[PDB]
Amino acid sequence: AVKLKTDFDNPRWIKRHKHMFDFLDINGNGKITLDEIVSKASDDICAKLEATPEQTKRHQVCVEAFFRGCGMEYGKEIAFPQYLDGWKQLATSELKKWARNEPTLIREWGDAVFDIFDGTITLDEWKAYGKISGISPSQEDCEATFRHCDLDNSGDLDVDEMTRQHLGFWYTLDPEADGLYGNGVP
Numbered sequence: 331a332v333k334l335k336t337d338f339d340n341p342r343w344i345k346r347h348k349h350m351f352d353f354l355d356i357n358g359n360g361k362i363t364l365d366e367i368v369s370k371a372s373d374d375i376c377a378k379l380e381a382t383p384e385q386t387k388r389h390q391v392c393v394e395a396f397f398r399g400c401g402m403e404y405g406k407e408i409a410f411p412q413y414l415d416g417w418k419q420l421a422t423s424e425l426k427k428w429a430r431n432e433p434t435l436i437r438e439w440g441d442a443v444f445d446i447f448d449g450t451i452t453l454d455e456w457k458a459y460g461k462i463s464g465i466s467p468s469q470e471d472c473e474a475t476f477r478h479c480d481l482d483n484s485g486d487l488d489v490d491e492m493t494r495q496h497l498g499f500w501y502t503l504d505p506e507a508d509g510l511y512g513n514g515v516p
């Protein structure tokens with residue numbers, strides 16, 4: 331039962347997103363652009379995963395939409411506070427879509443990522459994504475991810491499940507989502 335109540339002033343949610351912000355801020359100058367996010371998605375991740383140009387393009391479209399949801403844009407340098415406001419807007423919109431059974435941006439992003447590893451992904455594939463995207467380079471943390479989630483009979487992870495977990499993790503600080511990335515993301 332996905333938590334749909336938001337908790338935007340909870341220091342743990344804020345911290346989760348500051349962590350991710352700093353993670354995206356290679357430079358460390360306190361500012362990120364859509365250009366850097368998309369380059370990470372397309373030049374870094376998709377290339378290393380050896381996705382087809384079609385998969386690469388659709389993944390890029392999903393990433394563009396997702397981060398535009400939080401106010402990001404090409405050539406626009408964004409600092410953390412504005413970024414976080416943008417995330418409040420994104421979360422709100424996404425939860426409204428989810429409630430109405432309209433596809434979320436996080437779901438569609440998920441569909442692209444899973445399609446690259448193709449309707450499930452394995453623990454090894456997730457460790458691969460973890461190290462390549464850099465969100466979860468500790469294989470133990472990825473194993474903690476697979477222990478956290480409800481896997482299928484094959485021991486693999488479903489996109490429905492990962493979407494529910496991600497809704498809980500990024501949008502609502504759902505207690506049921508805590509530890510989704512092990513100790514990799516607070």
Ligand SMILES: O=C1N2C=C(c3ccc(O)cc3)N=C(Cc3ccccc3)C2=N[C@@]1(Cc1ccc(O)cc1)OO
Pocket residue numbers: 346347348350351367368370371375393436437439440441443463465489492493496500
């Ligand atoms: O959810 C994910 N992410 C969330 C954030 C992120 C970034 C900033 C925040 O403030 C909060 C979250 N950053 C990255 C990594 C990434 C960032 C940018 C471009 C490419 C990849 C990321 N990768 C995902 C992709 C994914 C999506 C749906 C799935 O079902 C499975 C995998 O997997 O967990």
